[PDB]
Design a protein that fits this description.
Strand content of chain C: 5-15%
Number of strands of chain D: 17
Distance between the termini of chain C: 42 Å
Order of helices and strands of chain C: HEHHHEEHEEEE
Protein name (chain B): TRAPP-associated protein TCA17
CATH superfamily of chain C: Trafficking protein particle complex subunit 3
Structural class of chain C: alpha+beta
Shape of chain C: globular
Organism (chain B): Saccharomyces cerevisiae (strain ATCC 204508 / S288c)
Chains: A alpha+beta (about 210), B alpha+beta (about 140), C alpha+beta (about 190), D alpha+beta (about 425)
Helix content of chain D: 25-40%
Structural class of chain D: alpha+beta
Oligomer: part of a larger assembly
GO cellular component, one term (chain B): TRAPP complex
Bound molecules: palmitic acid
InterPro entries (chain B): Longin-like_dom_sf (IPR011012), Sedlin (IPR006722)
Pfam families (chain B): Sedlin_N
Number of strands of chain C: 7
Largest sheet of chain C: 4 strands, antiparallel
Amino acid sequence: LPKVSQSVYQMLLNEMVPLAMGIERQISRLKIEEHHTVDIIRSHNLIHELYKADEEEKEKVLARLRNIGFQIGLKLSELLIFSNNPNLKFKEMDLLLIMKFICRDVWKQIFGKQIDNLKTNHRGTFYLLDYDYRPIQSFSLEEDAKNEELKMIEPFLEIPVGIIRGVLSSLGYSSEEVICLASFIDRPTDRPKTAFPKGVSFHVQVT
Amino acid sequence: LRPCFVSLIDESDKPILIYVPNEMNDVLKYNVLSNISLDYFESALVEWHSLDSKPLLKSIFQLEGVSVFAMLIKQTGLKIVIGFEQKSLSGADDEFEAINQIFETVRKIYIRVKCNPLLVSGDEKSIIKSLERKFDELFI
Amino acid sequence: SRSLKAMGEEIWKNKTEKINTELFTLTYGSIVAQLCQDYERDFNKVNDHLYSMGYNIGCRLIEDFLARTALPRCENLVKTSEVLSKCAFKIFLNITPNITNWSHNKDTFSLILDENPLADFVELPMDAMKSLWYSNILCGVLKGSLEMVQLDCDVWFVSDILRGDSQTEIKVKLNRILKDEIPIGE
Amino acid sequence: LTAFVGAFQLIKNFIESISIEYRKSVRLLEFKHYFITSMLSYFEFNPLLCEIKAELLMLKRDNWVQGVMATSGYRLMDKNYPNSDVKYKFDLLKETFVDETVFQENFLTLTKEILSLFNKCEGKRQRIVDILSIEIGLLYYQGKKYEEAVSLFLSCYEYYTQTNWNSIGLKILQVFIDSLSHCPKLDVLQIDGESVSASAVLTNAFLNILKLCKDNDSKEIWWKKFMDLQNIHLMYPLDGLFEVTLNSKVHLARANVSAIEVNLKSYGFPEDISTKTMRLSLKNMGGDVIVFGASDFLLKKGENKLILECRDIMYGEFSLLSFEIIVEGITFVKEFPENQDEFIVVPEIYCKESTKVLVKQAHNLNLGEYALELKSVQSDALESLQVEVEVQKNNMKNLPVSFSMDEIQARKRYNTPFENVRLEYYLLDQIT
Ligand SMILES: *C(=O)CCCCCCCCCCCCCCC
């Protein structure tokens, strides 16, 4: 079956925060393509601009990238249901089976590795813990400025949240009862020290 | 082994599309058959697959010279129901598998058209036209 | 050393990870869909923003293509066309564009996309049938890559199967071979 | 119970197989009907029990109607069948269909029995119940017993048009309208309570078929049947017959009237309509409201752009509230949504040949004697004019003015024209 290179995919999947930030500039470096002078701006410039723009524009870009991830997850859902053919139902009240499916197949198809262990409230919310989080395994600023790194690298945590939201959509629960938040609160228990120090945690709320 | 009508219904019993592959009152009859058919998915008369994680096919009923077959997609709530004639069937396993092959072909068409990343959010006027174009392209 | 054929198959078979092309198509489709969505369907110059997208992508992809292939700096249009046609696409997208429509005195040529994984399944709306390109990122990436290989080219789309034309063609006309810089020590 | 179901898939698969394989046999239906009625003999004591019996007897009656239609040719309503060249002789039961009269009654009896059996299946199966009920309705319509048909259809008056079953809606509505039309009086009917008027239900059904049916130009029959036949003021959810867009924005049209041009695509009706009055409402952020309306307009068939004039205007920002058309008898309304942030402004357009009142602080005055001056540009000939001036409270509980030294007056309404007049003023405490 046809394939495409993981490197170009990983880079493209990384690079929407500059897209989601520059679209805002166009809504609210000169050069000529053929006859008319278009303007282009770098990626790290827009990452820093998002880091220090202001709160409402930051929230707008966060919801922007959440919409992108929602589309991706919702739209890849039907493909995964066709191909893998799991044992789910349309609105299964057993959230554990849905979360097992997302942990086993969706992430195996998007990223290269199965997601790590998960908590089980059995009543309300769930936690999804990822270690070393492939797309941003090669990000950094400085030897000392680690505090700014985690605050600047925040919006890149949205596209998997959007993926989870979208996969839950078109599988029963809509985007009015479900909310999810990403964070770095996961700590490396005993794993080998990779480039990025902190794993990520997706806290998923479903009533 | 042409189909007399093809019906796609979503989770909410909103009929997505009840195409007839061209009498002036035929779409009427096929709609009545489809509406009668849509109930059996929530019926204890026949046990659905619930095994091996595969869409399982059954012959649901048959009225007034139209053999109607159906699929419930467990993991999405999509419902496919398409008809066939008495006078174009033999009933052996080879045809029972060929009609199944037609079923996956139809579901490919629906996936492809709904998967087009230019549908704005929910435009039924666009979805219906695209599905109708694909069905015309196939059955002709 | 070895032919570009052997190089392309060797690098593609055993020196790169893989994913399903459907998922890459899905991602790029999501990008273009939302750019259509949040921009009042201004197809006249959503293409410009997609060009900026593609340029920013390609300028930093070239560092990886050269990292794997390790070819010398291309000098003439013949070798640039050969390498782009034969290995540059084969590493990433696993396709082999065909080259025809050679211009006068070897200053321009055309990439024919026989199969476009970026558009495995699309039916554009009626208003887009003569406005949008949907694959501007590809030529943007090409120009960005050639910028870092230090040869400037005007690259644009002549035709697309999506709009209705018979085949998808990308003219890649060179403009000038800008030279290396020197220290400005007086 | 587990035996009963498995027996039913067994018999259903067997009848399927024997029907498909035993073809060309002239005695097929003869065998099949007696087979069905014999096989039915074992279930006689649950919801599943009633379901199975009803389904089997439904198969029975369907084969029955197939046989009688093939051997007799009398169409039952309109359900046509594949015209097989080979002839089938279903003649051993030539008692229920020797005549076309008792035939319909017998089929009605079978349908009613099946309806009862399905209705005794708790509540897990309503669809075939509803379809069968409308089959009884069509049988009554064919039998020309419209009094019962209209009463039966009053239940499912409008069920299959919001569920996107447009063809089913088209049949049920057209037959309902026809049945209501032919019989003379039918002057009082009730749906689920107080009797709704015959005119109201009739025009509701007519407008529903007009908005639902789409046949380019052959709905002219329904158009003529509406405008030749038959009031109470009635509102409606406009969406379906007309679509409205805001072309451009406000501009001057005449001396002292703002005007806004708008285009509307009309395709609910096939021919032209003389609307007596049209009105667009633009709500204000504070809460105020205004109206734009141009009356006695012949709406062209298709797409047309017209200018709406306004008389009373409050300069500022507005959000559109509701659009409306008043046809002779009916008032279509389309209420726009709320919190759009797509506000349209109404700027202070100024013209030479237009009457206006100007208010300002007085030019010449004494110290500590505050006042105001009112002018009137182009006072000229004016039949009448009244100007009302009042103050807004600011502490949100103050009123920093009195037009007197005794009472706290905050208004003085004129009744006569003026070229220039000096209004008086007295500050309360300190306001700037
Ligand atoms: C001399 O060495 C010239 C080398 C040719 C430049 C390499 C071009 C790399 C870019 C190919 C297209 C990548 C796919 C973009 C779509 C996402």
